[PDB]
Amino acid sequence: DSGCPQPVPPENGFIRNEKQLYLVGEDVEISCLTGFETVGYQYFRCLPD
Amino acid sequence: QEQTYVISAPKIFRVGASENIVIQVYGYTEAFDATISIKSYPDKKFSYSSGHVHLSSENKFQNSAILTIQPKQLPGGQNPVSYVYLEVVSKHFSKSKRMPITYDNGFLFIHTDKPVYTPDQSVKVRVYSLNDDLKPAKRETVLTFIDPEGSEVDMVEEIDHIGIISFPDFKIPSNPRYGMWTIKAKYKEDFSTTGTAYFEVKEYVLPHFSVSIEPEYNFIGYKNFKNFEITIKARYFYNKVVTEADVYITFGIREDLKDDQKEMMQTAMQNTMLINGIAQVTFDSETAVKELSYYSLEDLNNKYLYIAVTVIESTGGFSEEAEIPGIKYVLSPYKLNLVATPLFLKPGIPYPIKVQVKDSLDQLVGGVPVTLNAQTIDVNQETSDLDPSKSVTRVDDGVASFVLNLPSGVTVLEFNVKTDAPDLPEENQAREGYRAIAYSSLSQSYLYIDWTDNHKALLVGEHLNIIVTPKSPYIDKITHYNYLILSKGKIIHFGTREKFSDASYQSINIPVTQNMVPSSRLLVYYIVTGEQTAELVSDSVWLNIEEKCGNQLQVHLSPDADAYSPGQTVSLNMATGMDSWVALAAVDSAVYGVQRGAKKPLERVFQFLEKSDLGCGAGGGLNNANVFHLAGLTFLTNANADDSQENDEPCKEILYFPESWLWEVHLVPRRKQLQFALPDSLTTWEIQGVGISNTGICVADTVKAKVFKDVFLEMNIPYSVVRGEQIQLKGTVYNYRTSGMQFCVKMSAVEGICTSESPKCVRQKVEGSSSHLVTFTVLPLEIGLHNINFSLETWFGKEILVKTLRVVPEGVKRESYSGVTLDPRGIYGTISRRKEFPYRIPLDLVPKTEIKRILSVKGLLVGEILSAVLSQEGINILTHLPKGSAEAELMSVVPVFYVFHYLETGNHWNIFHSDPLIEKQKLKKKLKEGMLSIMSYRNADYSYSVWKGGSASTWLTAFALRVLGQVNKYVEQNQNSICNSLLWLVENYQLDNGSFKENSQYQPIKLQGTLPVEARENSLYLTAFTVIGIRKAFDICPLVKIDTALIKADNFLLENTLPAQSTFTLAISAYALSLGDKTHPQFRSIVSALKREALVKGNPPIYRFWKDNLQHKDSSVPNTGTARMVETTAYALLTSLNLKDINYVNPVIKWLSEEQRYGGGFYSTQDTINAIEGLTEYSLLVKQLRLSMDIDVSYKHKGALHNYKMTDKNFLGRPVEVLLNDDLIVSTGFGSGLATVHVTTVVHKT
């Protein structure tokens, strides 16, 4: 299917909605550990490639 | 075995179809009835359809039942029904067979008014919607637009009243993604057919002339490599040659038809003049490549010659770019394939073989010489050979036809076919070989269809005349043979063909009917029961039928000419064989010029109707069951055959200036006339009528109305101009009169443009049959669409091009994004009910652009709700084992709290279907009597003890506290006791690193405690247990030092746990920390460990669980080992739930619900309580995730902007334009479930 693997989050980030494989166009939401706060667009869009 | 039957049925039942099931019985002579029925599987309980059929001598014991599986009678829901019982019952026999069913009834054709759209256009779309019988389906259709990102964009459902579904126009979202958008159509309800279409959303201007690159053929080999002639032609869409132009050719060595470094060949980049619209060119690969690159030969380049061509009018402002994406350099150019060739022998019938020759980047090569050689194997492997026949392929079909006279002894033929390519060795003239096997009759009781290779299409209403010969030892007994005619899945005709006295048999004389027109399949069968044993004998042939439309809708304009004139009023006449709906679309032929080979929307629609043919190949078969299976049938018989052995891979054998208008649907009552004015475009309007009626779809002849003006201006206004750039609007005046003319062209423009020439003017002259380059320099001052009137004051009055210039602001258009996940229940924590997006005007905005903003919302559906429950046998827990001494009371009552909670957390007290535990009042009485009995165990100073006078146990006290906290949500209880017992447990038994160290109870009460690991991490176990209890109770007495104690204990767990010795301890402490800082890095590390201790079954885990110390080899009966395993699994599960990781959880709920995997029942309390807890939580979670969220979006200083009624039926938020300057609020109620809303800000930065 070529749906995207689970991405590497930013450091001190974690994947909110962990999944083994993401369908094309799934938002995976990054969120920051307790010390840290997401500034920006926390979401990665799994592209068809 | 004289008395036998065949019931013949479509291989697969289409739901909602009418399946004509035909029964033949042999050797009966008394009349009898049979019933044929479709019954639910496996229970046979519901009769979806039944048909009563009389079998008798005037029937000739042949009849059929029209059975229909009505779609709403199938149970539906989470599981589709994959199977059904076809059953027959009579006085003499009964049999039932599991038949597959398919939810795939009918056809959805999506007609998009253009292949290509600029932004800011609306894509008009309509779906033609046909039943399995090719009748108007009258089913409402869900139509889904997918941006090439693949993100769902929009869903619209429209009622089908007509078989034409005129959807609302889909306005391209205000920042589309360019490229191939997808439209998916699905029937809204039961049937799950799909239609799909594509349209390209692209910045384009309609090309003015169709530059055509027409290489002699699509490959280069030894012949061509030195010299490869390639022809350029260019014609205007009004179809007059571009009388002169400058042609620019550029070449590249393209390794693959991919985005590439083209390695352009400056050695070969070439100019030619387009003499009268044509320029022959040739490329020499030798001088080009050797002079520029290492590659000496195409031995080095099994690759592609890229070629791009620019044609510039040379006397005009228009230029058009054409390309071939690549021409294959090839050592071996061709490949063979068979067409319509059964690969099955009919011994004594001439065996036709047809090979097509395809080149690379396949097209039919037409004229390649082909030779075929074969070895003939007779019975007992008596092998022999045939002389190699030769044939040239048919020039207009690519087919080399062959016929081999085969002796009736042949058992198998294996034959090789090779290209006698004169310019190649065989080592490059590719060659292929195939096995053809005889019918393998057991009795040698053969039947042959004497179909004379009549691949020429049959004509509707002509009588078929197929000779059939049942050559059999027992032709004395074969009174008659049966035939079936198949079209799509359906048995459209069936019948019987007597033996004449001479032992000739009747031909199949039946006329070919309009229901056959795409294709048909004739199957012919008999049972002969010689000796005492029946053989089903059968054959089939592919029948190629003409694509004759049923309604034969034809469309023509009433006036006729070489060309109409702009604005000419014209009548369109639609004439049809019957009352019909007809859908009209006119598009500019230019629009296909935007692309190379843009296929007309409804190309080859009959070739799509053909895909409902359940058979494959040209007929024949390996065996009777194989003959039926390849015909797309299946059968019930007692005649010693079944096709359940016949399963196979899927079978792939081959056998004003508008751009579009007239987008209308009319009832044409056998005739109708439209009148309209032809638009001002000087172009060929391809007008496509599509008829729909009770006889299906008929895409008509595409009328091509030439719109033409003797003398005119056409202006090459680019799609878009950068604001405030000096640009030449180039153009061309054309004179197609034989006399020359003197013309003045001038530009009249709105004040949003300022202009140079400002002319009456120079009054230049143009020759006859000629065009003069015209140009204007302009500066666009302001953003938007500005009317420019180009005009041509000249003999015969005037011409005036009313045009719009489109002006875009300077710099770079940047897009940047913000969103939020709205979790109005805290599904992930903090209640994200509301968010605010300030209108943050950037520091580097270009002076007068507008910031565009666009908002959309995605519903995050919960997915698979794996549903698991306690049995009503939880009456076992309600009515538990005696309330005796030795804490047996505690074991009795503790589970009752949990079971009450479980029942509270669900429908169980909304509804019991059976065995009700509905008397929640009595259950609450028993609950509070329990809480009394446990509070009895409280000692003096708010410790608990196993006994009224026993040693104070911190373990028991934390357990009690857990219980009481859990139940305080349902029965209010005196929190002062909770405060006192909490501060007792903290102050007396906290110690650093080793929190809540246990006071000696002298024994593990293994019925209530676990048996922990004793040597090490006993303290990690106990700290975890106590932290769990406190986290369950501190919420109802949040005294500050209890929080300090939680800080201490959590820190100690986070530090000590990570090198866990035991999965049990790891699990429980993971849980305890999940109650605490869900997001601490140490916690996440421990989680990431636990998640790897997990054991699973299946490539995607179907089951997941945790075990340690091999306490699993002994799982046959519930015991301490299985108890521990269940404990540690339930802790893992609880943990996950607190992470809200449903995808993880699900296979753990599936494991936990299969009693056998842990020895049946639970053992001890802990496992049981934790399992009930986990199922409770999981239920809860699933509810919380259920998407039901009416999301308000409103500006801050103004009215509401949109209301997304997000629901699992309608989870997709259409992109809403948010173009006003207000700060933007998005909010929702308590709602339900989880959504994410995204606003993208698009702005031009200097």
Ligand SMILES: *[C@@H]1O[C@H](CO)[C@@H](O[C@@H]2O[C@H](CO)[C@@H](O)[C@H](O)[C@H]2NC(C)=O)[C@H](O)[C@H]1NC(C)=O
């Ligand atoms: C371009 O020419 C058209 C006429 O062909 C102009 O449109 C007319 O404008 C006048 C004044 O506003 C109206 O009274 C007419 O009814 C309009 N006719 C039509 C058909 O729209 C248009 O204003 C001209 N534009 C420029 C920039 O010169």
